[PDB]
Amino acid sequence: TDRFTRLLGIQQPIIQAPMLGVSTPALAAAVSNAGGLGSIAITGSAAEKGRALIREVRGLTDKPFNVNLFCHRPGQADPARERAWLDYLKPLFAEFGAEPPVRLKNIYLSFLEDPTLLPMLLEERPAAVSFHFGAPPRDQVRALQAVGIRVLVCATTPEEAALVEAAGADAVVAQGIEAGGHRGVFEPERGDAAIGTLALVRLLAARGSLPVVAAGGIMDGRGIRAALELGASAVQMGTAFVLCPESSANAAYREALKGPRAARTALTVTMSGRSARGLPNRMFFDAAAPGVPPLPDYPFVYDATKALQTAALARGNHDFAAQWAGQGAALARELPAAELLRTLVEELR
Amino acid sequence: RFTRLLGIQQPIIQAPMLGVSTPALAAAVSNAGGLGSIAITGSAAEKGRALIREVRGLTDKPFNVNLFCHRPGQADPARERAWLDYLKPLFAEFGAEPPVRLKNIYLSFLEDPTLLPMLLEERPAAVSFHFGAPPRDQVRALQAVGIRVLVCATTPEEAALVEAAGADAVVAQGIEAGGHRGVFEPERGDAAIGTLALVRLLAARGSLPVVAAGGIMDGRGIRAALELGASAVQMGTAFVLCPESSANAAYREALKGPRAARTALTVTMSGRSARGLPNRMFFDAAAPGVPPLPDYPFVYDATKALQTAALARGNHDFAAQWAGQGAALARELPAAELLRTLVEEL
Numbered sequence: 001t002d003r004f005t006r007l008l009g010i011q012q013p014i015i016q017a018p019m020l021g022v023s024t025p026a027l028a029a030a031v032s033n034a035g036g037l038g039s040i041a042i043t044g045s046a047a048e049k050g051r052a053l054i055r056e057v058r059g060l061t062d063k064p065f066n067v068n069l070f071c072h073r074p075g076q077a078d079p080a081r082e083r084a085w086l087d088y089l090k091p092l093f094a095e096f097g098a099e100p101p102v103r104l105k106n107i108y109l110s111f112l113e114d115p116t117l118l119p120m121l122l123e124e125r126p127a128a129v130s131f132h133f134g135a136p137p138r139d140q141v142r143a144l145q146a147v148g149i150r151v152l153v154c155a156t157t158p159e160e161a162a163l164v165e166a167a168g169a170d171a172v173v174a175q176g177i178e179a180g181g182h183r184g185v186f187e188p189e190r191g192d193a194a195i196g197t198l199a200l201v202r203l204l205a206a207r208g209s210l211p212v213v214a215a216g217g218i219m220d221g222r223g224i225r226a227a228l229e230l231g232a233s234a235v236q237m238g239t240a241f242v243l244c245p246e247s248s249a250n251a252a253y254r255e256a257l258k259g260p261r262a263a264r265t266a267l268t269v270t271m272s273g274r275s276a277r278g279l280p281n282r283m284f285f286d287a288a289a290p291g292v293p294p295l296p297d298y299p300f301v302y303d304a305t306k307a308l309q310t311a312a313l314a315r316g317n318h319d320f321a322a323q324w325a326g327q328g329a330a331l332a333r334e335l336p337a338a339e340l341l342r343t344l345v346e347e348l349r
Numbered sequence: 350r351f352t353r354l355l356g357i358q359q360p361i362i363q364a365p366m367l368g369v370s371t372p373a374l375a376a377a378v379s380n381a382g383g384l385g386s387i388a389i390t391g392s393a394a395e396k397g398r399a400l401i402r403e404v405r406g407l408t409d410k411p412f413n414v415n416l417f418c419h420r421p422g423q424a425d426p427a428r429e430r431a432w433l434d435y436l437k438p439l440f441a442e443f444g445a446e447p448p449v450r451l452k453n454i455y456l457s458f459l460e461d462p463t464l465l466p467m468l469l470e471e472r473p474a475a476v477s478f479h480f481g482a483p484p485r486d487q488v489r490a491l492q493a494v495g496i497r498v499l500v501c502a503t504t505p506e507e508a509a510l511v512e513a514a515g516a517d518a519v520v521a522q523g524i525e526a527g528g529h530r531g532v533f534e535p536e537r538g539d540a541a542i543g544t545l546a547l548v549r550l551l552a553a554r555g556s557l558p559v560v561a562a563g564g565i566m567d568g569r570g571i572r573a574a575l576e577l578g579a580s581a582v583q584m585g586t587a588f589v590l591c592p593e594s595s596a597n598a599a600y601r602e603a604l605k606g607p608r609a610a611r612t613a614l615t616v617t618m619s620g621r622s623a624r625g626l627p628n629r630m631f632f633d634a635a636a637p638g639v640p641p642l643p644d645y646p647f648v649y650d651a652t653k654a655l656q657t658a659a660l661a662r663g664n665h666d667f668a669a670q671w672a673g674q675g676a677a678l679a680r681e682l683p684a685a686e687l688l689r690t691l692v693e694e695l
């Protein structure tokens with residue numbers, strides 16, 4: 001199908017997934033120059049810094065690229081809950097001769113609570129703007145579209161996909177249970193249908209009319225071929241690009257992904273406050289276990305964890321790192337992004 | 350390919366489905382060119398033999414006979430007595446009271462020695478195993494006669510154990526699948542891998558023909574699995590609405606209707622994780638007030654007692670209505686006609 005590639009003015013139906021902390025302008029430009037759609041994530045950063053990152057990408061590529069923003073429900077501070085969480089983490093900090101932070105901060109501002117992001121986006125005009133955890137109001141999506149920007153939203157169910165349609169997006173990113181990183185569920189408090197890529201992509205393509213981008217578990221040309229047979233118009237690959245040299249994955253992350261840990265992934269809500277999939281470690285614990293206090297809101301939880309990670313890292317310890325990977329992780333390859341992009345295009349045939 | 354490995358013309362297996370599959374359904378699929386299947390667990394061996402003879406009465410073509418190979422359930426009177434006490438108000442609602450004791454109503458292939466020699470005589474083209482792999486010993490014993498041996502796995506780790514046991518094929522069950530999850534050891538957790546990842550993994554780093562199971566509802570779904578490296582396909586939910594199936598009317602209406610839009614996993618129906626259309630038997634076993642679960646299949650024994658009492662009042666809110674995550678794509682056709690349509694779409 002030409003549906004997606006024509007929609008975004010690119011050659012290849014391949015998006016390199018925006019991965020906050022792992023994607024980079026070098027990674028994005030590499031994929032975009034190679035004919036796909038490279039991406040960056042700019043949540044957690046001030047608008048002008050977002051604006052700089054976009055321009056960094058432009059200085060590397062003249063081809064379309066994707067800019068991703070978190071659109072979650074703005075986190076609700078709860079100092080009592082947050083204090084009880086910190087006290088619970090106290091022995092972990094003490095292990096590295098450290099103390100937990102005194103307070104926690106809303107480190108990731110939602111697109112719905114930072115008014116300055118939309119106007120900056122309407123100025124920079126990246127070819128694509130994608131959202132995770134929810135959809136903006138239709139008039140906001142329309143404003144970006146009015147300026148030539150394609151709008152992507154991640155959905156995890158047919159019900160969420162309907163909301164993406166109502167928001168007026170140009171394409172839906174259909175994220176199956178296989179996907180590495182944070183799950184795109186809109187309202188985790190209602191539960192999580194946890195639908196696999198194969199079913200979700202088929203359900204959205206066969207019973208919907210929006211171009212579908214399949215995300216989760218896709219690691220090669222056979223996977224891409226399979227996604228297209230299901231009716232997707234393109235794929236989004238995260239894990240597959242992590243070992244690329246252009247990525248900002250650290251040493252230990254690359255080692256975990258290259259090694260035997262890659263055979264088994266798991267979901268955690270205790271790392272960030274929102275369900276996410278990666279290589280299990282000490283930050284993957286049972287929040288339902290005895291003596292574990294109620295969980296603070298996302299993203300305050302991640303703030304607490306990031307403080308612990310820093311303390312851990314200050315003693316050579318990476319057992320608390322966020323090493324996100326999808327269920328196809330064992331098929332991970334290590335190539336320069338543009339060479340990987342083209343290997344995929346070849347395997348895609 | 351796999352289609353040569355078994356005596357068949359089409360690479361589509363109609364999943365064996367305890368209480369849903371019938372000799373009539375199996376025969377219709379086998380006569381149409383695929384591999385029809387029945388489930389034999391929970392029947393004494395001479396009763397399972399009778400069922401196999403029923404299928405032979407309707408088709409000369411190959412079929413599949415399925416047996417549970419789970420870690421045999423272990424009785425805990427204290428835990429079971431507390432479970433039934435917790436269910437007591439549900440029973441009471443339909444004028445019943447919980448059964449005295451619970452029973453091991455489904456004997457694993459590991460604890461009933463009379464199943465293997467029956468299978469040796471009857472010699473169906475295919476014998477499949479769910480929840481675990483039997484000793485390579487016995488797989489060879491079946492393979493010595495005409496039999497191709499299939500075992501379901503939910504992870505590459507389980508697939509390796511399948512390979513070790515000398516099976517002719519591994520059924521790769523993704524998270525999408527309806528009914529009981531084939532996880533060998535659930536108390537060790539459950540990786541809950543999706544079909545798309547699982548098939549690719551097993552086809553990329555495995556040696557056995559892999560049969561994709563979970564979420565496939567049409568020819569595009571079959572083509573996708575084949576692109577992933579599958580040699581064939583196993584489909585349960587797609588066949589439930591076939592008039593030949595053993596699905597009762599309430600079940601058929603549920604799957605045809607809006608409830609098909611959402612499935613979920615429950616361990617409280619049977620004591621082992623299973624995917625279906627949620628109802629009053631889908632509750633939170635971690636919830637305050639809910640006691641430790643008995644082993645599988647003792648829990649299902651209790652549930653069935655409750656299902657009887659609910660049915661006698663015309664209440665279907667406790668039924669076992671299994672369905673995979675592709676449930677909303679279900680179609681209602683004669684089984685042979687569905688297989689023909691699938692083949693055309695493929």
Ligand SMILES: Cc1cc2nc3c(=O)[nH]c(=O)nc-3n(C[C@H](O)[C@H](O)[C@H](O)COP(=O)(O)O)c2cc1C
Nearest residue numbers: 017019020132179180181216217237238239324326
């Ligand atoms: C390390 C990592 C970071 C990710 N970061 C983001 C992110 O910041 N925003 C987002 O919308 N998706 C993020 N994703 C998910 C992708 O959008 C996509 O759903 C996923 O990578 C596809 O599954 P796969 O890893 O199996 O290819 C991330 C995934 C990983 C593995």
Ligand SMILES: Cc1cc2nc3c(=O)[nH]c(=O)nc-3n(C[C@H](O)[C@H](O)[C@H](O)COP(=O)(O)O)c2cc1C
Nearest residue numbers: 364366367479526527528563564584585586671673
């Ligand atoms: C109602 C129902 C009953 C099932 N019964 C069995 C069974 O008795 N033994 C078994 O090994 N698998 C059983 N399965 C699972 C199938 O083998 C297969 O894994 C699953 O149906 C494939 O997922 P699908 O429903 O999306 O096609 C059953 C599935 C359903 C929906």
